[model samples]
Target chain A: ALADLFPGFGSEWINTSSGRIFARVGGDGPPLLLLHGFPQTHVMWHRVAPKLAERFKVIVADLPGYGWSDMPESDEQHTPYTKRAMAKQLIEAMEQLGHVHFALAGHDRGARVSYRLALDSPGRLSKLAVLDILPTYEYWQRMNRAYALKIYHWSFLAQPAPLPENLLGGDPDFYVKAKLASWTRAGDLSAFDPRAVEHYRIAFADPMRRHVMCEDYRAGAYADFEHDKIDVEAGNKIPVPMLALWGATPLDVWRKWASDVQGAPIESGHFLPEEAPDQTAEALVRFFS
Target chain B: LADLFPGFGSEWINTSSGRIFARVGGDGPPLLLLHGFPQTHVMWHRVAPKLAERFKVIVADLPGYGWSDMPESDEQHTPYTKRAMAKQLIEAMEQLGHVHFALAGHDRGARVSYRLALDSPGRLSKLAVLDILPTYEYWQRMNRAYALKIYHWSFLAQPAPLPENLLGGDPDFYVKAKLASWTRAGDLSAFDPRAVEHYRIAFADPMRRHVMCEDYRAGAYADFEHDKIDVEAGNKIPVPMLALWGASTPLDVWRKWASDVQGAPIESGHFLPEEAPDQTAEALVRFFS
Candidate 1:
């Protein structure tokens, strides 16, 4: 069933410092690397990548410490779960597979890594799409009473110690389900397909996966912000064309920051590829065309 | 504080029913009654009535089984749950309140009554609106799945005798909260101010509110459908003039129906009055000028 979603795809399990990363490669065109968000794996783009694969060589890979990837034995590593490190590792893995430059698009957590890639390796990425996110620094700096109260999960998850891990690990599926349900505009539970839901449940149920997510937030708080500061000071700009698709009805906060950010240009949408599928496809086609 | 939001203006305790109903009335018009859906009444026109009294007078009351109205001891004797019964009650109240001749507008349940007035009396001096479609006939004839799902009026109004009663009696707060939460858009909780939240919370509590709501839905199944059919056959309303407003982004059924109903003197606007008060008032004034 999963293979059907990733037709013509060939995968390689590559070793990293943390664990093995399962990387999938398919099609033959400009290399387009795809990354999925937390509580989700590279499988998030299963429905999307194959179609894009017809036009572009699609590379979808599990991040270190997620999905079929290796779990880091120790959280004490200096650059553990940092986007810069993740990007570097991913790029190295891709290089091992003989792809140097690629267009990157990521949803949720994957988008965060893509953001870091834009900053770190601006020359490598041809174009980028960051789905449904704001840069970590802007998000932290703009935390007001109203915004924080409304989106309590961001700060709650980003808490320094074991609070997030403890609460989320208690019932991973329940926590993930609650988060997904609240974040979605449509209250319809059936919006997410059953197969995808089960995949998410299994991935989140793993203790290692839970720990990795906590570490991601921790890295965001400590390392990612510092990286962003250095990049800003160095006049670092994502020179590639950028498409930032967002759900407009509730007005994703990233829409506000996209205006302020200097770098690759950004475009937005309401309910991309679902509510406005044609618009989304067109936006992508235009950006990459 | 209540006046901070567009529609929310003022609130008053309805001592007669022990339920608090927000009242926003104006002094230029005569008796121009406005009613809202479910248990709460007059809150939809909370801002309008204040302006209405300038022309002559306007008065609105909670329907006998909704908002401040006590639940009638005998459930089956009067079809108070149905929109038709509520319409009858409104007419009766207007006559009793000495509002022999006045313009009337109701949203949700109140909209049903407005349709009843148009169909039965067909002689209202003037008409205006907050939001709602013509009544039962439109709901019965509509074929869209979204309309059906959203207008699940029959589910609440199911006549199970004791089961429905038990359901209503259980927590009371559960029913209220369910209704309140369901009616709003996803981000409403985050964006809506404290006073607005209070209004929503207050109205969504208590057993009477739920009963009255169920009754309104029941009324739609029994009487409103019949009324709509009759109006469809007869065709045309005798009343003159005014503005119809709708939430274009979300798309309300009533607003769509208002556009289709033949032989009615109505002008439509895309935004709710509170959202676009200046435009709404201008349309109303011009229509009635």
Candidate 2:
């Protein structure tokens, strides 16, 4: 166990058919797993993960194609890139490391995967928090002209051919800067911290990283949409208490659909954790406690 | 005479020198000329020239480095590269064409030329306007975030080795789209006519157009700033004025700087020839008569 590497922490490396998984654990009481988003490693939860770890045994692991995990040799077969697939891999990875059930909180892309997890493995998740985003299908269908134009890169990357890769490769910084700049309100470039920006840049700098991102978006556009549709038809509901918090400036469509998704009761807010961290944390604590 | 050509009403061709000139004759008094920025020559003034001819014959032509004129081999040497130089060329061009003194108003770039005529060759006497921006120095000095961001393109275009040229390249359409989309107010974009869109697009596309626009701002930063400083110190134009408008928006800094700048007796109207043609014509006739 490498978890001892940090104070009061234990780490376990579990080998499975999927790959070798590195898990870090700390604290006591109930179990909690935190998943991170694309162009980001598990370290996204660095600020709050420790706090959760203080009360619960926290498990954090990078997704199969991201962070410290091995890059796939080929994605030609398109072997399960959907949120559901990623959720399954995380579950199996956790089980191999000796955990059967846990509450989970996911930010950005991880939140989507968490949604799929609650759908597929309801008994495994006691509570869930989706930090941002609704299901991919709902987002695409409900997007307006301003959103479509502003977030055009999502569709651009989701294209199946080499166009997105070629355009992005020309000047990766241009793509990164444009995305980061536009995502924030106009005239406020200083909102993001420099170190966080550098971390994101480094994550996406690798060709393998870029491929994984494109594949994930492709799956979102294709497989994930269909997956959600099937789940809806089958009367599948996420059988867990869920907390959904989104930034209010751009209303999150996912929060709207969560009520219909057959999940545990969900509560939402317009601010991110930093903007209303105490409230967000309190909501989570109340839901899972 | 080139004026004999099908579309060449009141036109001239300098065959030996490879230059062309045009003048429309009218009945009222003398108003020198009107021209558009960076495009199909003095043709835009054709409609205005014909209308003005009903009162006073208007002399208009595509000055050097515009329209059918030879493209400047060294762009830095082009007269229209800055406001001061463009003013000099317009005066010399008018002198060569035999109208050393006449009332004049210009639209867009031509408006800057008209200001030069009023400022330097004060002999031209009276002035009327057709929607002109105040000197660039004034805009830069105003500390508003929206204004500064709106003016970012000016700075982007003015730097040596042209960033706009590099970013825009041959995709004139993209350049045009950028300008057209930006110029429209959020509320009016959905209903504006195609002609307005076409004009915005045409002027903003291509490296030359971008460079020309940058030149306008450069003049503001350098020559125009100096001129403004001098005006504020002592110098003033006491000429009479008739300010007309085709739209309801404010014209120049007239409302603000009218009292500040010691120039002329000013009378402003809500519309141009169509809306207040009688009042505009009467005001012009009375002032310049």
Candidate 3:
């Protein structure tokens, strides 16, 4: 039923080292891979991807442990969920889909994956557009009061599992719905289609998903930052042309990590694709074209 | 009704600003004990009696915690800052006829202890901070390790109502799990049932949960700013400083904030008072005496 949002798209389950990754493949021409953020699945790109598909073949996939993706058994270090591992899996999935290189645009946690892919797999991405986030390293380094408060979930969800998992599971519906609404400029769930929200709600309500979701942040707390730190210290910026789109936010941090960084603040909240689909699609089409 | 702190005289002291609930007993140089997050003055019940043999021990709930009065916070979260809490504590102690006293604070209370040492110099003869680093150092060094270990620093500081609502859903479980996770044992075995009941009672109230969030909001805001100013200006603790940690040590970080700092790692976790009371009490005796 979640696939109803992506009409004409062919659903594929590609095998990776970790497990199977689910993706919706559509359109033609050059390949453009789209990735969704936390508490959401590939369905999040429903609004924007169709417009993007008009110009280029579009592939929208859920990050591992997110939606329609394998919740791989994580190591004690939560290695599987690290953006690096997640990116590598996606790379494998893309390669299997017959695209060795592609244009990538990702939002939130997926944006983290997008940049990791760009950094780790230098020639794999022709263009990279990150939606609404600074590098994990930069985020940790600049956790002042205002930013810390705004990104509290970065810490909350990252707390050693069972705590966050238990608390969130107590009222998954309330937690998930409130979260989606709070991050919007309109301060409600209006931008989200009820169908897409149903997907998010179902995914979040799963205990396994909740655990892996925390692991994703646990990785952000450690492995993700470690990877970013190594890259930063080595003076290795993202090799691809990086586009940063944020909701009334900044790109100064991205400028530090990329050579050809360009972006403008979008007039929306965190969910750029859903809230400003036309603008989001237009920007991606223009950049990728 | 567990009489954890036996033979202690309980009273509510009306400071010029608000009411503070305190337990007082024994006779010597006044020694004020303060508790931490999701806990009350009861956290010190195990160690307070032993220390009472040498010092006139006073254990008081921080404002908005335990049975203490919860004051309305300002936009800047001024009222919940460690500076504000320290000032009221000084007033409370002054009212109790202890013009000068020794002080030991754990967790949030330890933050208040350091702030008190900075703001009201000459008021504390000796200061022992249990299981914490300076607030500025905390935010400044919020790397993977600290961010994961002390996620609550960021989580509870989120703008009011979000963290409050999530936590309020299962305050009993949340408080118990939080207390347990911070201990070496990693379970509720170290915590007294009576103490946990008190914590549950406080946390279950939506108002108290909001107040707790304000405490952290102030911590991330006014408290961090204060520490930043002092750290930048090279302002260090004037009084003799004793630092204690469990499961790890941040003695190096503490050294940067105070001129004369001495501490050792206790064989416990964050809850040094309850998890390793003997070692904690012994450290305090040696340091304070």
> What is the clash count for each candidate, in the order shown?
32, 9, 0
lDDT of 3 by residue, A51-163 (tens): 98888899989898888888899987899999999999999999898999899999999999999999988799889999988888988887655566667788888777678
Once superposed on the true structure, which residue ranges of model 3 sit more than 4 Å away at CA? A1-3, A13-19, A91-102, A118-128, A133-135, A141-147, A229-267, B16-18, B122-126, B188-201, B229-268, B286-289
- DockQ-based CAPRI category assigned to the predicted complex of candidate 1: incorrect
Positional deviation of B55 in candidate 1, in angstroms? 66
What value of lDDT does candidate 2 attain over all alpha carbons? 0.53
lDDT of 1: 0.54
Error of 3 at A251 (Å): 7.3
Best by DockQ: 3
TM-score versus the correct structure, for each prediction: 0.47, 0.48, 0.85
Candidate 3 clashing pairs?
none
Ranking by TM-score: 3, 2, 1
Docking quality (DockQ) of candidate 2? 0.02
Error of 3 at A242 (Å): 5.6
iRMS values for every prediction? 18.2, 12.8, 2.4
Candidate 2 recovers a fraction of native contacts equal to 0.00
lDDT of 2 by residue, A115-208 (tens): 8888888778877888766766666554442234334445545655453454456466655654555444342335444555665677677767
> Which regions of candidate 1 fall more than 4 Å away from where they truly are?
A1-4, A74-78, A233-235, A249-278, B1-289
DockQ of each: 0.01, 0.02, 0.45
Error of 1 at A277 (Å): 5.0
Q: Among all windows of ten consecutive residues in candidate 1 chain B, which has the lowest summed lDDT?
A: B262-271
Give lDDT tens digits, candidate 1, residues B1-289.
Answer: 2343243344433333233333444444344445554323323332353345344433344544333445453444243533444355444444434343445454554454456555555345555655554545444443322222332343334333322332333333433344344332322332234434444544445454455555544454545555556556764444553435453311244333343221222232222333444555555555443
